[PDB]
Structure formats: C-alpha cells, structure tokens
Subunit: 400 residues, 5 copies
C-alpha cells in the first residue's frame, strides 16, 4: 500500500549497511544468540563429523529502523534481505564443511521500535571428537562453537539464551540427553581484545539394540559352536575343519566390524578386546585339538607312555570326571605252525590293548579341555561385557 511504500522509501534513506546501529558509538551492542535443534542427521564415527539440522536465533535493536505506527496505520513489521541492513557475522568455529558458512540467508524481521530478528536455517557439519572406547555402549559429547568473527568484546556484547528442543524429532539410533550452553571470553594471538563465544554441547546416547542383535549375539553363538570340537570323536576326521572354519568366519567378522571404526590410537575399543579374546580362545582350541589328535593316533611301537602322565590321566582326571576305564614229525610241524599263528594273534591283541589305552587317554584330555575352555569363555565374555559403564542401564533401556 501507499503507507508501506512510503515507509520503505523513508527507512532506507541515508542508511549504511556497514555501520553498527548504536545511538552511542562508545557503547557495545547487545546481541542475544540462541539455538533451535531440529534433528540429528548423522554421526560419523570414522570421519569424526556430526551433521545436524538447526535454526540459529539472533536478536538486536536497530537505532535507525524506528517509526511511529500512527503515521503508517497498517504497517507493523518490515523485512530486509541480505546485503541491505547490518547483520552480525556469527560463524561456527569448528566447521567441517568444504565451505565454511552453511546457513541459508533469509529475511530479517523488524519491530516498529527497531527490534530485529534473524533465524537462518541450515545443515551444519561440525568436527567433534568421538570416543569409541566403550563402543557400542558409548555416550558422546559434541560441541558447537559460535561467535562473531571480527567484532570484539568492546563492540558486540554476545549473550546466551537456552537452546530450544521443542520441535526435536527423535532419531532411531541416538538418544538425546540434553544440550546445555556456555558463554566465555578468549584471547587470540591476533589482537589484544577479548572475543566472546557461545558453545553448545550435545550429549547423545547410542541405542544398542541393533548392535547387540547384529554383532554381539552372533559372535557368542559362533564361539559356543567352536566348543563342539571337543565333543566330536577323533575317529571322524572333522575337527580341524570345524575349528579352522569357525576361525575364518570370526576373522571375516573382525574385518566387517573394523571397516566402520576410526583408525585412532587413543585406546583399545571394547569390541576389539572382545574379538581378540574370542580369537585367542579359538586358536588355543585348535592347538588342543592338534595335541589330542596326536595322542589318539599314537604308534604302539613309538614308545611307552611316561609314568607321570599315565598315572595322572588314568587316575586323577578319570576319578574327577567319573570316566569309565575300558577293561609223527608231521604232527610236530603242524604244532609249531599253529603255535606261530597263535603267538602272532596274541601279539596283535597286546598292541591293540596299548592303542586302546592311548585312545582313552586322548578322550580324557579332550573332556578336561572342554570343561576348562567352556568356563574360560564364559568368564571372559561376561567380564568384558560388564566392564563398560552404563552397560546395565543401556540393556535396561533398550531390551527390557
């Protein structure tokens, strides 16, 4: 209308977008900076980058953009695009975007008394340190640092307002704990003037149902299956096959898991410890299987069983496991022939008795190692899983 056109013509008269709009040049300009979190788009553990969708909030008073509503009866607010009025140069310090500024420039809404509002949206990429020590039961704190680039503390007085999470849309992987803020002043090597900044810290908890169902349970099941090599009889040549195939599958699982993790050397991750323990156990099982097979296929003429191993294996472990322990000239010529045949048969029987003793010793060793390996696997798995903090509360919140 006529009043709106006249007001727009009058307001921009003699207006300089380069000038800080303060009545007194010696006084700082107060700007209220806040934030409005809308969504956590992505958390990149490998690249250490957090992607969020937020709305920035800025507010200040303009001394020159004031008018009397009586003279312009219908006009209450005006809007100015980029490059026509003064705006703060507030940037995100720890940006990880190929172009530093990610905000989308929009209009600035103005009171009839000079109050200005500026709420630019955008997709913000920031570089925050991600700790994988307790993965997948980890809680991450990622910081967002904002502040004016070229305005010091004597010119632009930055103030903080609490972040808004009313329109937050929950994520299926991360659980938001809170987003507190802090305002502080710092000194830089450039200049002798303090530069205030506002830092917002996003605290998020990882939901562990997916990882527990897709990584931890299959590893437990395969490790338990690797213990079946101690129930197979040695007469079936299928023990090394079982052990080695299980080991190969677990190595594949290590590779799949490590393809998603950062190559940091700060600490050893919990899942890395778990995989190392499982693989060491499986390798020891393969070694024990080799020893048991060596005992089973023992040549009777190779050598007598040592007294110590014989007594311990055939008495103490047998008692402990309640093992069952098995166990005219023509006439003379024919006589010596049948005597030779009978003696040969008796020697064969003695050799088979020795072989049976060796096989029983192998079975006893195998059963003992089964018990020991099962106990060790259970203890190691439980201890490694329970070592992590907030594991119990993660289980309670996710599964129960």
């Amino acid at each position: 209308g006529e009043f709106q056109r006249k007001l727009y013509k009058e307001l921009v008269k003699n207006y300089n977008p380069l000038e800080r709009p303060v009545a007194n040049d010696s006084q700082p300009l107060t700007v209220y900076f806040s934030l409005s979190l809308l969504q956590i788009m992505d958390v990149d553990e490998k690249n250490q980058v957090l992607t969020t969708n937020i709305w920035l909030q800025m507010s200040w008073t303009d001394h020159y953009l004031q008018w009397n509503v009586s003279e312009y009866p219908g006009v209450k607010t005006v809007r100015f695009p980029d490059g026509q009025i003064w705006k703060p140069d507030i940037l995100l310090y720890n940006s990880a975007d190929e172009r530093f500024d990610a905000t989308f420039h929009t209009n600035v809404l103005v009171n009839s008394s000079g109050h200005c509002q500026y709420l630019p949206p955008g997709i913000f990429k920031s570089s925050c340190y991600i700790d994988v020590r307790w993965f997948p039961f980890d809680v991450q704190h990622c910081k967002l640092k904002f502040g004016s680039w070229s305005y010091g503390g004597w010119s632009l007085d930055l103030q903080m307002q609490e972040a808004d999470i009313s329109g937050y849309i929950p994520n299926g992987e991360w659980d938001l704990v809170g987003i507190p803020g802090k305002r502080s002043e710092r000194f830089y090597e450039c200049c002798k003037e303090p530069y205030p900044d506002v830092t917002f810290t996003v605290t998020m908890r990882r939901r562990t149902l997916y990882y527990g169902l897709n990584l931890l349970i299959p590893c437990v099941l395969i490790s338990a299956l690797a213990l079946l090599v101690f129930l197979l009889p040695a007469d079936s040549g299928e023990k090394i096959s079982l052990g080695i195939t299980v080991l190969l599958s677990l190595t594949v699982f290590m590779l799949l898991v490590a393809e998603i993790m950062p190559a940091t050397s700060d600490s050893v991750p919990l899942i890395a410890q778990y995989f190392a323990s499982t693989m060491i156990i499986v390798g020891l099982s393969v070694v024990v299987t080799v020893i048991v097979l060596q005992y089973h296929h023992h040549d009777p003429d190779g050598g007598k069983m040592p007294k110590w191993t014989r007594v311990i294996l055939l008495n103490w472990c047998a008692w402990f496991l309640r093992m069952k322990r098995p166990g005219d000239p023509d006439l003379a010529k024919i006589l010596e022939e049948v005597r030779y045949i009978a003696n040969r048969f008796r020697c064969q029987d003695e050799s088979e008795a020795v072989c049976s003793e060796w096989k029983f010793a192998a079975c006893v060793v195998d059963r003992l190692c089964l018990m020991a390996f099962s106990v060790f696997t259970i203890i190691c798995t439980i201890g490694i899983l329970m070592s992590a903090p907030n594991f119990v509360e993660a289980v309670s919140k996710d599964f129960a």
Copy 2:
C-alpha cells in the same frame, strides 16, 4: 514491439520489490500453494532421505502490475526474473540438502489484471522417517512440509490446493498410493503470531518381487539343503562339512542384507527375525550331527548302553518310523591252539554285534531329528512370513 517496451518501462516505475503488493496494508495477502509430483527419484532407507522431482505452484494477485489491454493491443502477459518483483519466501522445512533451498528460480507470469504465477522446478531432498519393521513388505509415509519463513498469519494467508499427479512417471520399485495434503497453523517460540504451513504426505508401497526372488527364496533353498545332513550316512565323513559350509554361506547372506539397512533400534525387522531363526535351526542341526557322530563312533568297551535310552530308541521310535532292526600230547596242544583261535573270533563277533547296535541307535536318532527339524523349519518360515500385514496383498499384486 513499441507497446511491449512502453508497458515494461511503465510497470517498473516506482516499483519496490520489498513491498507486499496489497491495496490495503491491514489485510492479508492470499497465496494458493499446490504441488505437482513428477517422479520419485530415490528412497534411501539407510540415510532416511527421500529424493523427488516436483514442481511447486504459487499464485497471488499483484495490485501494482495491472494495465488496460486496449492501450497495449498485443500485450497480454509479462514475465519478470528473480529480484525484480515480490515473491513469497516459501521453503521446505524438513530439507536434507546441503543448501537449504533446492528450487530453480524461473520467471513469474503475470495477467493483464495482476494475477501472478510461479512454478519453479527442482530436485528436492527431504528427511522422512522410514520404518523397516515389515521390510520388504513395508508401506512408507513421507511428509513434505512447506510454508513461508518470515510471513505470519496476519500478513500471508497460505491456502492449499490438491496436488497434481497427472504427469507422474511410475517407478519400478515403489508403487504410489496417493499424496494427500493438510494445512495447519503452528506457534513458535520466536514470536506470538501463528505461522501456517502446508504438508503433503506421500504414501508409497514397495514392490516385493525383486526382494522375494533375490533374498527370501535362496535362503529357503539353502535352509532346506541344510536338512540333507540327516540323510548322509555317518560312514562318509562329510556331515560337519555340509553343515558348517551352509552356516558360513548364511552368515555371508546376513552381512549382505545388513549392509543395506539402517542401524535403528526402534524394532527388530522381519528379515532379521527370519535370518535369526534360520541360523538357530542350522546351529541346532550341527549340534545334533555332533551327537549322532558321537553315538556312531562308540567304543564297545566304553560302557553298556543305558537301559532307558536303549529301550526307547530300539522299541518306541523304531515302531513309530517302522524302522528295520538288524538281526597224543600234540593233539591236545593243537586242540587248545584252535580253541584259542575260535574263542578270539567269537569275542570279535560279539564286539561287532555291540557296535552294530550302537550304529542302529545312531541311525534312529538321526531320522527322528530329521523329521523334527523339517517340521520346525516349515512352521517357523511360514509363521514369520505370514506375520507381516499386507503380505498376502503384496504377493497377489506382485507375483500373481
């Protein structure tokens, strides 16, 4: 021509692109917002992003862009590029694009009576929640929220018009159900003025022929092949090999499937349940194979068969399956030699009879477990597949 040049010169006189074109400054400006869907370019389940190709539709009346056709006989419409006339600042709220605005700015067509048209095209990326609970038989609702950024309800009266799908090009993977719209007003923490918005919801159904042919059928076939381990005779040492290789292939299949799914913890997907059931069944089959091999390679001197297992296995299950149950001094010296030989042979025969009994018991156990595992596999597969809603209608629409 002369008339066109004169009209273009006259129209831009005293025109301010910052001013809302209303005759009365106290009245809202009515803008009709609609949509025109052209193609569903991509649906990203892992990143929760929907990519579509749409044309926006805007329409409003400009009070200053009016002229009499008699004075300009040949001129009926005029066009203005970006930055020369007022346009609404309508944006997509839930944008997932690195730059917030994705529209391509084009000309604005104007009546001889002030009516304006604006139809910018673009490739729009939006973040919509994708539910994989019933994958691959899922139906997705993705919302597109539009609204003016800096104009309230007292300034810009946003109205809704039904979306146009006349030029829609069908997608080979997703089946469009409909795109209804809804207009609503909301309050924001910024201001005390309502801000209307228009939301369009895209309902799409996944076509399941590809997934059924590439994932579900091979898993069924491999699981059925895993049941062949109960038909192999134990004398051939090739049962553990079959079982473990099938298990390894199925684990590879899990990894391939999980590489395409989001890491959400909202619920357990149907395909995840199916894979878990199949893998548990195969592992139990391997355990049963170990037990059967243990029974088959039984030492006759190890211990007598327990009475309970002997009677049950050799009577009840045999009846149930109609199993066939198998079954001068020189003369004295020669006499004792041949007596010893005959006694040795008789003892060997008795031992072989005991071994045959053990082998028959192993065969009976193996057949019983074959029947039980087959029934269980069929029941679990059918139940898991039928649990999903609209599974029957998906099958009817895709395969039949």
Copy 3:
C-alpha cells in the same frame, strides 16, 4: 576500433532485456532448436540416469539488433554475454541434476541483420527408464525433453531441426543406433495455453563382449565342473565338498552380479533366470549325491533290496548303458573248530557279496543321473540364452 565502439554504444540504447524482440507484439517469435551430441559419458542402470555431453543450438531473429554495414565498415558480428540481451528460457524437463540447469552460459553471436546464435555446452544428467529384462543383450531408448518454461505457443513458436552427430566420439561399451527427434504440443493444469516441446530419443545398443567373457563363460565352466561329482568314485569322500564349494562360488557370483542391477520389479532379468536355473541344477546334483552315498554305504543287515528297484537297476539301466555286472574225541573237537572257522568265513563272503551288489546299484544310479543332468544343463543354458531377441545379431557383431 572506433566503429566497433560506436556500434556497441548505439545498439544498447533503450534496449530492454525483458522484452521479446518482435516487430509486432501479436505475432509469435520463431526459434529453431536443435542438438549436437558429442559423447555418451555414462549410463547408470542402478540409478536410472544417463550422462551425456551435448551442445544445444538456438537461433532467432532480433528486431532491434540491426545495423548497416556501410556505416561500420569493419564490423560484421557482435557478441553479448548473459543478462544483456533476451534469450529463450529453454530447459531440460527430465533433469536428474541437483541443480536443474546444467548449461554453461556463453556469448550470443549476432548478424548484421539481427539473426542470433546461441550454442551453450554442458554435461547433462537426465532420468531415463532403463530396461534390464534382456540384460546383457538389451537396447535402450532414453528421451531428452526440451522446451520453454514460461513461453506458450502464442508467444514462442518452437521448431525442430535434426540432431548433429558429426563430432560424435564412439563409446567402448554402447553402440549408437540413432537420435531422432519429435516436436509436440501439450496442455498443463496451470494454464489454458499449449506449450510445445522438442523430444530427442537416444537409441543405444550394449556391446556384450565384456559381459559374455566375464560373466556367462565362467558360469558355464563352473556349472560343467559341478557335473564332475558324478565321475568321482564314492570310496573317496570328496563329493559333497566339490558340490558345496561349487554352490558357494555360484552364490558369490550371484551377489557380485546383483550388486550392479536395479531393484526393480517390472520383470525377471535374463541373467537372473540363468543363475536360478544353474543353482537349482547344482542343488539337485547335491541331493542326488546324497542319495548315491546313502545307497553305497548300505548295511547288509539293514534289509533286502526291494524287488522292483533291484530288477530295474540291475537289468534295464545296465542294458541301456552296457554296464558290466560283477560276478579220537580230540579229532572231532578240531573238526568242529575248523568247521566253525570256515562257516564264519562263508558268512563274511556272503555279506561282502551283498555289499558289492549295493555298490554296483549305486554306480548305475550315479551314471544315469550324470547323463540326465548333463542333458538338462545343456538344454536349459541354450534355451535361456537363445530366448533373448537380437542375441544372434549381438553375437555376430561382437565376437565374429
């Protein structure tokens, strides 16, 4: 020079870039639109996107950009950059680029009589439907739709000119058949005015030497190798290993092939049919191997061979394959001892004869199944390959 400077100063006087340059405002402006294909950069089967490098061609007459060559003796043509003269707003409708316009804006060459030329280059991404039903023997038609966005049929009369392929650079994977064009008018829900457009269709044929050498031949070789399981004697426990390892390799091959194909449900691809047939054949071979091993390791005391299977296997199939079918008190005491020994030996001989008969039956079954499986594999492979159209001409053009 002086004349060039004077002409440039005079031409831009009173010139409005917003005005359509026609002497009569009531008449349409004729614009000739053509195309110049230079290269087919990429064809994306998974994303349904075609990337090409083309030069657009536009031509029209400007009424205001005319001068007499006599007054400017050396000046014959002038050039104007973007934003200084009127240009048509011709766009690609089915664009798949994140920014809708992909042309690079260049100068406009002008006659001394007003004729204008505009040839912007660019890399164009368009969304065209790609049919994988006959892959890898498929021929694709991808359409490129061009037209003015905001100029109707009463203002801009779009005309078509045949595309130029003189500078086309052949691609090593796709064979160009032709690029015809078509001009048509359409009505839109926006307005009551027809909007002409020019559509160019690119017909391309896939060169199949690479795919035939890298996919089809290895599958044939591995499937043929899977038939070797019927030549291995059953005494060597290495049949299940062969069959299952071949099956695992073929499954890996399925995964590799499916990683490059779209997840469409329009139809079942030819290569998918081929893989399904091969895998079904291999699985049936494994089942037959299990049955043969069951027959070979038959307990003689298990049960007599059924009469029907005995007669058929030992007579009819043996004839068909010309199979070779194998086949004082002390004296009394010693007498009964040796009688017992001889009777035991005779019983052993009878049992071994029964076992030999069972083994021969297993061999006959194995040979029969070898013949049947070989014939079936050959027939299925040949039929599936020959089902595709233009397969013969593809083979002739690529291999021969």
Copy 4:
C-alpha cells in the same frame, strides 16, 4: 599513490569490456595460447577421465590500455579483475566436469604499452580414451583441446606456444614421456567460418612394479601350487580339496581385478587372457584328478583292463619315466576245511594283485599329467607376458 589513482581513473574512461581491442576492426587479433603442466592428479581407467593441475597462458595486445611512463613515473603495470576488461573466451572442449569451466579467474597484468597477461590456474577434468589392451604395460595418450568458443578465424587468430613442464612434480604411478601440441582449423555445422583450436597430447607410461608385485606374482605362485595335486598320493583324500580351493581363490582374484577395469568391448585385455588361461589349466587339472581317482579306486570285479591302455601305460610311459614296476573221515574233513581256507586266501591275493596293477597305472597317469601340465603352464605364462610390446623395457625401467 596519486599517479596510480590518476592512471586508474583515466584508463577506464569510455572503456567497453564488450569490444575487441584492435586499432583496425577489419584485422584479426593475435592471441598466444600455451600451457604449463604442474601435476597429473589422477587417471581414471574405469570412468575414462584424466585429472590434471595446469596453468593456462594467454597473451595479447590491448590498444586502449597504453600510457606514457614519464607522466606516471612510478607506475609500470596495472591489474584488472574479471568483468572489467576484455578477455578471450577460451574453453576446454572435452571437459568432463559438471560445470564446463574449471579455471579460477584471476587478475590480468598489463604492460605500459598494452601487452596483457592472463594465467588462470585450475583443476581440469577431461574425458580421454584409455586403452586397457596391454594393461598393466600400457602407454596412454590423452588429448586436451582448447579454443575460443564464439570467435572465428577472421576475428581471433589463435597461435600456439610450446608447453612448459619446468615445475612438473613427478607422479609415483605414471611416467611422463612428453606433451606436444598441435594447432588446426575446423569447420562446424553452425557457421561458414573456420574455428582454430590448440590441442595438447599428454603421453604417459604406467609404472608396473606395483601391479607386477601385487597381481602377477601371486597368480603365478598359486598356479604353481595348483600343480602340487599331482604329487599327493591318492590314498590321502585331499586332492579335490586342494584343486577346488585354488580355483576358488583364483576366481576371487578375477573379481578383484575386474572391479577396477572398464566394461569396454574394444578388445580382450592381456590380464584377462592370463586369468582365463590359468583358470582353464586349473580346471583341466581338476578333471585329470577326477580321472586318476577313478582309476585308483577301481573294483577288481568291474572288468579287465583294456589291452591297449594296459600295454601303453605299463610299458611305454613306464620306460619313458623310468618308473619302477612293482612285482579217517575226520582227517578228510579237516583236509577240505583247510583247503577251502587256503583257496580263499589265494583268491584274495589275486584280487589284491589286480588292485595293485590298477593303482600303479593311476600313478603313471598322474606323473605324465604332472609333466604335461607343468610344461603347458610355463609356456602359456611366458608367451602371454611376452606378447605385450614394451614389456621388456618396462621390466628394465621398473625392476632393474
């Protein structure tokens, strides 16, 4: 200073950036175009794209940008940014970048006598044909075509100057041979005026140490290991396992290699030929192993050895390889019993002799096939490797 400010004010007076700066409008303007190669950033065999870092060089004389140094004692050169003076519109024709122009616009340095210099840097992506016929011993020629877009031969006289490689930084994978240039004129369907262009051809040689160490050597080693199947005795059932596992590893190697190569059908690559030959050899080895196992596990009652194969295998090949060729009523009743026992033993001995003969024939066949396969593998590998040109010089330059 004052002189610099005055000169800058005076130079831009009446200056038109659209006007070609020539004293005579009828004469062409001479522009010297050269190049300065700095780095070869990437060579994309799969996408047929070359990425380089170069500096363009342009030079021309401006008639209007001249002044007397005496009047401006301290000023010798001036600089003008983009859009303030005339510049040639020289573009790269065969660009593969999503935006056609990749140069970074910088200042233009000007003499006191009008000579202008323009050296824009940039990262240039160009589409050049890459031939993989002799990979990894290939030499590639990639062309870079430059020329003015809208200036013909009667307006802009493009001249060529030799490229500069003084600041070239060597690449660890490609060896630069040279970069010659050529200037030529072409006619286009647009217009009846020739358009000169300058083409630079980059000749590069691939350094083959990495590929030879990572691809060729492991394949040779695994193929040689596959020949160990002819040294394993048949009594150990571990021949099919060796052969099939080697075949599976080689197939994995094919997949890894083919994941990096273009899907072109121009010709069959050398590495593809090598892999095909190795795989055919391994498959033939598996077939021979099946035949040898069939011979070894021969039933003595199956049938007499054919005379021809018997004589050839047991005489000619044995001689050739110097093979060692192995090799009262009660009394009557007891008499017939022991006669029966002895006759049974004699028949068993005869059967075992026949089996030994069959086993020796199998061993002879196995040794013969070992020799033949070793010779064939060596010959094929050497011939395929030596077929490629410049293979000897590549080996000499890389390894020695």
Copy 5:
C-alpha cells in the same frame, strides 16, 4: 552513530579498490603472512591429499584509511567486506580442490592509523607426496605453498611470520612434530621478475597402536598357526586343509591391506615385504606337507629306500632330535596248507615292517621341517619389523 556514519561516508570518498595503497608508487608494499593451524582433518594416502583446517593471517598498512580519533571520539576500528577495499591475492599453489580458492571471505579490520588485518578461515585441500615405504611406521612431511599470484617482488614484499599452533586440537591418528616455514623467491617462464612465496611444512608422525593391533598381530598369530601342520599325525587327513585354509585367509588379508594403499612404484612397502615373506613361508610349508604325505603313503613294493637317505634320516637326524626308533598223505596235505598260511602271514609281517620304517622316516622329516620353519619364520618377522627406522621409538611412545 553520527560519527561512525560520517567516518564511513568520508573514508570511501574517491577510494579505488584496484589501487595498491602506498604513498609512493615506486616503493614495495610490505605484507606479513602467517598461519594458524587448528586441526588435521584427514590424510589420504591413496589420493595423496591432505585436508587441514587453518586460519590465514595477513597484515598491511593502508595509506588512505587513516583518520584522527579526536574528530570521531568513539570510533576506533572499521570493517570492510569483500570488494570494497584492496586485498592481497594470496593463493595456495598446490591446491587439490575442484575450485582453486578455499578461503571464506570475511571482513577486514582497520586501525585508526591504517593498519589492516585479514584472517579468513577455510578447509584447505592440498596435494602432498605421501611415502608409504615405512608404513605403518612412517613420518610424513607435507608442504603448503602460499604466495601472491599477480604481484611481483617489486610491488608486494611478502614477509613470513612463525605459525601459531596454540589452538591446535590433537588428532587420534597423527602426532604433530612441528610446522616450520620458509620464504624464498623464484623465477617463472612468464616474466622477468622474481615472485616470493611462503612455504609451511607440516611434520606428522603416525600413531601405530591401531595398525599394530589390527594388522601385524593377527598375521603373526595366523602364521604361527600355520606351523601346526607339522604336529598333526599323517593318519588324519587334515594337513592340506589346514595349510590351504591358512593360505586363503592370508590372501584375503593381503587384499584388505592393499585396498587402502596407493598404487605407486617408488619402492616396496614394509608391510608388502612382510606379507610376501609370510606367504612364501606358508607355501613352502604346504610343499613340505605334500612331500611328507608322499613319504608316509609309500607302497612297500614300489622300491627300496635309497641308502643315502635311509642312513641320514634313520641315524643322523634321529640322533639329533633324540628320536625313538621303533623296533598219511592227508597229514602231509594239511602240513602244506598250514605252511602256506604261515608263509603268507610272515610275508605280510615283513611288508608291514617296511611300511613302518617308511612312516618313521616321514615323521623324522616332518619334525626337522617344523624346527627349520619355526626358526626361519621368527628370524624373518623380527628382521623385517626391526628394519624400519624409528620403530623402537614408535613402540615406546604408543604401547609403553
């Protein structure tokens, strides 16, 4: 305020952004260039690209931007955006970004006496040579070259100031050693004037805990497991399976490692040497296993053991390893029958004695090869690992 507005109006009067702000046109302008490192975002070994987050520092005196503070009591500094005042055109020479300039343009802070400050941030991608000869124990020097593009040494006197690392944020993978700088002048083929530049070299050390835990340790464990093939008895056909499966796993590990390394031919990496040595050792182990199996399954009728191998194997190696070395007419008719039976048994015993001797020789060979292979593996691993420089200090800093 009024003073700020008046000063801003007065300062821009007659100001030309194209003019170098020096009082005397014949004198160079001194510019101080420094750097401020904030983070090392990424180091790309495969693409030879380093990504860092730095702040540039520039400082110079402007002769025209001076004023008296008394006349403007409250104003002490002013800020000017891009394109309104003169700025140096300092660029990064070895940029690897698709657009050459990566800095984000910000305001320029100005003294009341003319001193100017300019600190643009940005994400910088540079192409630096990365040496993988000692990977994963490598130290990398990557250079960042800065300098004015179009200003020579007679116009812009570039000076260097030491880099600032106060706000550096440590990286979890790379350890910063230091960032020294160097200023030098160079001549270019363009012109006869020297062009100074400032080069900063970033020295970084890789933290090796992650790589040592994920690559080196599993390889050592698997190589040690491959030595178990010399403890398995030959009677269990599970030696070739163990060896070949270990070899296949190691080949997979090679592929995983090589997927992350550049394809350079400068030198052979340490990890490549380690993998080659391990694979050669495993292959030799497989060959030795084949030989041992050949000795074990020796036909007694094949041929007498050669005297030399017999004496050496059964005496010298047995002594060295303390190996245990095992070891009326009717009456006449019955007489010859039992004589024949006894002679057959004696011949069988002699054959079994010969076979036992061969088996013992095989065991001796196997034990000898076990010892030799273990020693060789240990020596090769230790030597290859210790060959790298700073390996000891890397271990001390990371693990201890």
